[PDB]
Amino acid sequence: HHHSSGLVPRGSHMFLTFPNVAITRDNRIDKLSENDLELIRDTAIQNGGRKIQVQLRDLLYEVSNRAVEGDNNTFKVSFSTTDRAMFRERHIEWQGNAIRLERQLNT
């Protein structure tokens, strides 16, 4: 970066970034910590069913609570992009990681 190492980008609850996310030998996310999952859950809850963004390694995931009516503590994971090159190149791991994140959020 063209800025001092004593300065970092200001964060937002709209965009959560998890730096040291463990990777599995099959090129997938491992189990996130309980504190990480609770932070994602609480942030999605505070946004009342509207999507928040979650950065795991170098990919972006969209997460919302209110996945189903009746239970607000149900979480949905999706992803979206415009650049065809990144989708063409990463869609398989992106989808698999999205499944895993959803599974961890609801277990």
Residue numbers in the entry: 9 to 115
Q: Any passages from the paper?
A:
Here, we show that the Salmonella Typhi STY1076/t1865 protein, named StoD, a homologue of the enteropathogenic Escherichia coli/enterohemorrhagic E. coli/Citrobacter rodentium NleG, is a T3SS effector. The StoD C terminus (StoD-C) is a U-box E3 ubiquitin ligase, capable of autoubiquitination in the presence of multiple E2s. NleG effectors share a conserved C-terminal U-box E3 ubiquitin ligase domain that engages with host ubiquitination machinery and have highly variable N-terminal regions presumed to be involved in substrate recognition. We suggest that StoD recognizes and ubiquitinates pre-ubiquitinated targets, thus subverting intracellular signaling by functioning as an E4 enzyme.
Therefore, residues 1–101 of the domain were expressed with an N-terminal tag in E. coli, purified to homogeneity and crystallised as native and selenomethionine derivatives. The 2.5 Å resolution crystal structure of StoD-N was subsequently determined by anomalous dispersion. The last six amino acids of the domain are disordered and not included in the structure. StoD-N crystallised as a tetramer; however, inter-subunit contacts are predominantly formed by the N-terminal tag, suggesting this is not a physiologically relevant oligomer. Indeed, size exclusion chromatography with in-line multiangle light scattering (SEC-MALS) of untagged StoD, StoD-N, and StoD-C showed that both the full-length protein and individual domains are monomeric in solution up to 16 mg/ml. Despite two loop regions having higher B-factors, the four subunits of the crystallographic tetramer superimpose with an average root mean square deviation (RMSD) of 0.34 Å, indicating StoD-N has a relatively rigid structure. StoD-N has a globular α/β sandwich fold, comprising two α-helices packed against a twisted four-stranded β-sheet, with one parallel and two antiparallel β-strand interactions. Second, ubiquitin has structural homology with StoD-N, which is again made structurally distinct by the additional C-terminal helix. Therefore, StoD-N can be defined as a new ubiquitin-like (Ubl) domain, which is striking in the context of the role of the full-length protein as an E3 ligase, which uses ubiquitin as a substrate. In both cases, these localize to a defined surface, which for StoD-N comprises the N-terminal parallel β-strands and first α-helix within the ubiquitin-like fold.
